[PDB]
Amino acid sequence: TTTILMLPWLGYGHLSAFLELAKSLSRRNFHIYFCSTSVNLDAIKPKLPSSFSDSIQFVELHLPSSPEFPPHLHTTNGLPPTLMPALHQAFSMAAQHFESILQTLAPHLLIYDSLQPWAPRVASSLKIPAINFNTTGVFVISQGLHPIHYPHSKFPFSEFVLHNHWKAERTRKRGEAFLYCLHASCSVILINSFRELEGKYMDYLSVLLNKKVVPVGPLVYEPEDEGYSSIKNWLDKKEPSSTVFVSFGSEYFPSKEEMEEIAHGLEASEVNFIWVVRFPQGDEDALPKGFLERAGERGMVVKGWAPQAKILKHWSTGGFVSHCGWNSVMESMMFGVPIIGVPMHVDQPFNAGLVEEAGVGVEAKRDPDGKIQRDEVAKLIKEVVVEKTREDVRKKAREMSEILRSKGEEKFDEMVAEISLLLKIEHHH
Ligand SMILES: O=c1ccn([C@@H]2O[C@H](COP(=O)(O)OP(=O)(O)O[C@H]3O[C@H](CO)[C@@H](O)[C@H](O)[C@H]3O)[C@@H](O)[C@H]2O)c(=O)[nH]1
Known part of the structure; x- marks a missing residue:
């Protein structure tokens, strides 16, 4: 009433x-x-x-x-x-x-x-x-x-x-x-x-x-299985904590140069990845010509929209390359995924700092002119996911997840x- x-x-x-x-x-x-x-x-x-x-x-x-x-x-x-x-x-x-x-x-x-x-x-x-x-x-x-x-x-x-x-x-x-x-x-x-x-x-x-x-x-x-059926089928074939999810939100479209840097950074890391690439509502080339090569069945590019929450809760996902939007950051902390931050604009740079401060992830630093670096992205993915040699980051992520779940x-x-x-x-x- x-x-x-x-x-x-x-x-x-x-x-x-x-x-x-x-x-x-x-x-x-x-x-x-x-x-x-x-x-x-x-x-x-x-x-x-x-x-x-x-x-x-x-x-x-x-x-x-x-x-x-x-x-x-x-x-x-x-x-x-x-x-x-x-x-x-x-x-x-x-x-x-x-x-x-x-x-x-x-x-x-x-x-x-x-x-x-x-x-x-x-x-x-x-x-x-x-x-x-x-x-x-x-x-x-x-x-x-x-x-x-x-x-x-x-x-x-x-x-x-x-x-x-x-x-x-x-x-x-x-x-x-x-x-x-x-x-x-x-x-x-x-x-x-x-x-x-x-x-x-x-x-x-x-x-x-x-x-x-x-x-x-x-x-x-906490999550129709609309697109999950194909994605879960593919994800289950991968080893635990071996795949990264890559999303930059719904209100920002990365540049041609920016996506080239991230694509090459993903390839160098040798990790498995699911990448949501989006185009504006108004309207292969956007990714580097031939990118999807070494990343044949070691990568997926979803068009339009993906089940972010379901993918992040899979046991094959050990990383999330994100634009550090607030909701994505909270989801990654709730689900215990370490964040590989690539902030783009607005509040995202501060949120990436907050992830770094809390120990639940690492921020890929921009170069002096503000340009994404292939080598920086690859290093953090390899350290966090491919070769799990940044184990402090991983432990704090599940500890943070454990804290959040218990509320x-x-x-x-x-x-x-x-x-x-x-x-x-x-x-x-
Ligand atoms: O493929 C996708 C992409 C997104 N989501 C969900 O959509 C939301 C996206 O979160 P986030 O990226 O933080 O929100 P956006 O609206 O895309 O981006 C904004 O997020 C901030 C908080 O809403 C705003 O203040 C900023 O303008 C901007 O960064 C979350 O629930 C995600 O789980 C999915 O389920 N699937």
């Missing part, structure tokens, strides 16, 4: 984490309204089992639609990078529809993502409580806000220093770091992380923002307390 409306940001990684949060709330007697674009909602429904039909209802948010920008492109999954500004515009232009949904559904609480400032303001206008859920890590956020208060000192608890390539919209984001708060809705933030990895940063961020930081993560989905339902105890208090304060309002 208490209804929460969840509004994620467009984009599969954000969408999945909200769904895992939705499932937890549903099991706690909370009626959920899951709101997003139709393309995103369909992509995420298979992961929602039938048992939640009664308690989790899907709500469609309508973005402005045109014949060359139809609703299937109203997402960041496979979107051409040129079209992303249009997507940001279209999302903002949907605020008025959000009001109609919000007023008509009368949710007691709104949980929103960290990329739609119009969503809390719309909720405030209609006397609806709103709480921020941040699907990504705390390390990046704290590092960003540290210079504003202490431009003098270095980052207090980390020995990581950013590389020159990434040192180098942001305008609107440095206006979110001064966001005023004069109500309980903004007294707390939900974060997709856990203290064993970012406990010190969570304490620091709480001081920086003067707000409660409540961890509710990690939110990993029980107490993971959400703090969140339910904060929402309950907030939901009482608004009865008075």
Whole structure:
């Protein structure tokens, strides 16, 4: 009888984490309204089992639609990078529809993502409580806000220093770091992380923002066998811990030079590999001519989409060459796979540092101009996977996995307390 409306940001990684949060709330007697674009909602429904039909209802948010920008492109999954500004515009232009949904559904609480400032303001206008859920890590956020208060000192608890390539919209984001708060809705933030990895940063961020930081993560989905049948057949023929999974996400498409370096790095390592290579939604050559040679049956290149979670939980997988996106990093730590980091942009360089700090993987360093190196990638794959001579990395990965697996339902105890208090304060309002 208490209804929460969840509004994620467009984009599969954000969408999945909200769904895992939705499932937890549903099991706690909370009626959920899951709101997003139709393309995103369909992509995420298979992961929602039938048992939640009664308690989790899907709500469609309508973005402005045109014949060359139809609703299937109203997402960041496979979107051409040129079209992303249009997507940001279209999302903002949907605020008025959000009001109609919000007023008509009368949710007691709104949980929103960290990329739609119009969503809390719309909720405030209609006397609806709103709480921020941040699907990504705390390390990046704290590092960003540290210079504003202490431009003098270095980052207090980390020995990581950013590389020159990434040192180098942001305008609107440095206006979110001064966001005023004069109500309980903004007294707390939900974060997709856990203290064993970012406990010190969570304490620091709480001081920086003067707000409660409540961890509710990690939110990993433990897995139709759509593509797995062929992949599992191939994977079972390989020796244990002999194969690497290579993925760079759904919102970034590596360059021609970048993929050549990684392909050659894979070949030199002599490892087995499953590589998901993707092309934008709009539209052999991309990989080096003749690459798939020594890597005949020692490698697979999947087109479009692959079962990342299932592959990583196989016992033949001993490594994950990743772009160090937050959800992929959490999955690798949950499943006990050491990460071979190849960060590309956004928060990924910081997340790669966090993996290195935690001892659960190694980051392949970029050259002075910011260019991927074949030799660096090959060395780490050989050391981590082909010749298991970096055994400290491997042990910490399973130890981290063991820690993550052992967490029980107490993971959400703090969140339910904060929402309950907030939901009482608004009865008075
Ligand atoms: O072949 C694939 C590729 C991805 N996934 C899943 O899709 C998600 C991808 O995670 P991640 O790569 O972290 O998310 P993306 O949306 O692809 O990338 C973003 O991940 C961050 C957190 O969502 C964002 O803030 C950044 O803009 C961007 O790096 C995870 O659930 C993966 O398991 C699969 O199941 N199969």
